[PDB]
Design goal:
It is found in: Secreted, Extracellular space. The chain has 25 helices and 6 strands. With 598 residues, it is mostly helical. The chain has one domain (1-598). The strands form 3 sheets. The protein has a two-stranded parallel ribbon with strand order 1-4. Strands 2-3 form a two-stranded antiparallel sheet. A two-stranded parallel sheet has the order 5-6. A hairpin with a 6-residue loop joins strand 2 (317-320) and strand 3 (327-330). The chain binds L-captopril and zinc ion.
Length: 598
């Protein structure tokens, strides 16, 4: 019998019913009120029951024996019930606990280090600016400590029941745990190992940047503050979680003398605005014959932090309302070079949305979560190059010295190479929890030992099992899988390298056309490749989506390394010239107790 009629009917409903859920999720996250929180959870509970019933109806159709896939593909996916598999009581309890951590994160406020009266400083604007600009280790320590105690510790209990229900829901779907359930999204039994492999190839590179940054930081802050051979004290790497270090390029770039690609201040001087930035981002896509932003986007998107005293979630995000042309972004945008990439990052999501609207709801997602987080980053890479920044006048007079090129790759290494091990630890940690590998009595150290092993970083002050820091990371609090980023930072280079080749910008043979300097801006063959891939949306396992992009079907490290080759070689020499220590000894920042009040 034909269920193509069934599925078509059903997807159309799901897309209708998810629309409702999406408007409540979006109202909440634009204005955190209990009422909005209640409506939001209400809708999901409702949707959850529909799914349960929709799931039992499919027992009618024995698709495990059907003929054509796609159809046979839509059932395997529509019957994979996530948290909705949980009985009524638990699903609701999960939503509550899930709401608790999300709003706790977003509602954090600390008191200004030099004015204990204020206490209205928030993470997005204020704190992120301090961690990023201050050069007083004691002040960055203050803000580190103040933020991790509120954002992580305060929500340890909820986080524990979250893992419990997460696990419960995963066994309810025939998965080993929540861990193996996330991995399933990549449809490949050897995925984790492929990633463990690639990380190994780039690690050596990671351990040359590490010792170097540590060299300057220690030269700048001093021996007493940063020690040689020891892991790098966070709070000093310019990022609350140390996932990216570009913010401290003013003190660790090898050539601050040679032009620094810091368009950030030339932006502010030119009166750049959030709106202008989105429009610039709209341009790149249309330049590539990609789809232009629809009218609902400019009408509904929130692109600047609301000015009232209301609470909201401001960790940038893009929304697919599952209709036709109703896509919106919510960003607390600021005029700075990092935010500029972010806009593009977000538009990468929007693009994908538009690219697969026609697809049956079930397939309206990304081929492999990795693909979703990479689109917009590929354009960002182009925008970051001297070529494209001069072309738009955000870099007046610039000379490609040679040692100016080193900066152009080094400033990129702090966000792209450096990130690889951070994102890997994020899920390795949550995987070890989902799997019963760790004892609740060691939950907070496993996280730090893990930040130690892979990143060589440690907290500003001693923490203990009394604290719980993992939740200080938005995604841990909001339950958002993180492996998608690791995969993105790898393959986004695979995309970029092919785009530039299809575009007349990259030639491996001769020079004058180096990978780190193509712009693909205005490239039609590029957007073309980007259309064959995006338009598919989950309709096929990812090896097929990629193959639609460049004929290849494998994920590899042959992209970042080739891109950062000139940097890697420049460092080895430099590290011997300065006698720079490589590698680090285990950390002494995870313990338990100890006070001097007798
Ligand atoms: C806003 C995006 C997701 S749409 C995000 O969370 N990113 C982008 C890069 C890293 C990571 C982060 O902020 O931790
Ligand atoms: Zn994203």
């Amino acid at each position: 019998i034909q269920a193509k009629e069934y599925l078509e009917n059903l997807n159309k409903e799901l897309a209708k019913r998810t629309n409702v859920e999406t408007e409540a999720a979006w109202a909440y996250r634009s204005a955190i009120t209990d009422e909005n929180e209640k409506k939001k959870n209400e809708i999901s509970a409702e949707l959850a029951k529909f799914m349960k019933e929709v799931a039992s109806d499919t027992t009618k159709f024995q698709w495990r024996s059907y003929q054509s896939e796609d159809l046979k593909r839509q059932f395997k996916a529509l019957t994979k019930l996530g948290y909705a598999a949980l009985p009524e009581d638990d699903y609701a309890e999960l939503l509550d606990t899930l709401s608790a951590m999300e709003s706790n994160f977003a509602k954090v406020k600390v008191c200004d280090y030099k004015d204990s009266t204020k206490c209205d400083l928030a993470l997005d604007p204020e704190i992120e600016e301090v961690i990023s600009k201050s050069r007083d280790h004691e002040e960055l320590a203050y803000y580190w400590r103040e933020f991790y105690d509120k954002a992580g510790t305060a929500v340890r209990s909820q986080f524990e029941r979250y893992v419990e229900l997460n696990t419960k829901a995963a066994k309810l779907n025939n998965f080993t745990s929540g861990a193996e359930a996330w991995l399933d999204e990549y449809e490949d039994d050897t995925f984790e190992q492929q990633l463990e492999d690639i990380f190994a190839d780039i690690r050596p590179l990671y351990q040359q940047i590490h010792g170097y940054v540590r060299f300057r930081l220690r030269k700048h802050y001093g021996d007493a503050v940063v020690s040689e051979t020891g892991p790098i004290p966070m709070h000093l790497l310019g990022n609350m979680w140390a996932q990216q270090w570009s913010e401290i390029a003013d003190i660790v770039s090898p050539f601050p003398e040679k032009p620094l690609v810091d368009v950030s201040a030339e932006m502010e001087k030119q009166a750049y605005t959030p709106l202008k930035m989105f429009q610039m981002g709209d341009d790149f896509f249309t330049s590539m014959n990609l789809t232009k932003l629809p009218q609902d986007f400019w009408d509904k998107s929130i692109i600047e932090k609301p000015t009232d005293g209301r609470d909201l979630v401001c960790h940038a995000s893009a929304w697919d309302f599952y209709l036709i042309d109703d896509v919106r972004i919510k960003q607390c945008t600021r005029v700075t070079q990092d935010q500029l990439f972010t806009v593009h990052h977000e538009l990468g999501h929007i693009q994908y949305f538009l690219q697969y609207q026609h697809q049956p709801f079930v397939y309206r997602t990304g081929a492999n979560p990795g693909f979703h987080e990479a689109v917009g980053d590929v354009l960002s890479l182009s925008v970051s190059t001297p070529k494209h920044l001069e072309k738009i006048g955000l870099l007046k007079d610039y000379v490609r010295d040679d040692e100016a090129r080193i900066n152009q790759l080094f400033l990129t290494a702090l966000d792209k190479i450096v990130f690889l091990p951070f994102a890997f630890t994020m899920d390795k940690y949550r995987w070890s929890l989902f799997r019963g590998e760790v004892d609740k009595a060691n939950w907070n150290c496993a996280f730090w030992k893990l930040r130690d092993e892979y990143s060589g970083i440690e907290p500003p002050v001693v923490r203990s099992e009394k604290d719980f820091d993992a939740p200080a990371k938005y995604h841990i609090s909001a339950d958002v899988e993180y492996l998608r980023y690791l995969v993105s930072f790898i393959i986004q280079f695979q995309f970029y390298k092919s785009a530039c080749i299809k575009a007349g910008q990259y030639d491996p043979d001769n020079v004058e056309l180096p990978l780190d300097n193509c712009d693909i801006y205005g490239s039609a063959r590029a957007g073309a490749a980007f259309h064959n891939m995006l338009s598919m949306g989950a309709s096929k396992p990812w090896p097929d989506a990629l193959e639609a992009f460049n004929g290849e079907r494998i994920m590899s490290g042959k992209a970042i390394a080739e891109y950062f080759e000139p940097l890697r070689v420049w460092l080895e020499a430099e590290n011997i010239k300065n006698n720079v220590h490589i590698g680090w000894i285990t950390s002494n920042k995870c313990v338990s107790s100890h006070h001097h009040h007798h």
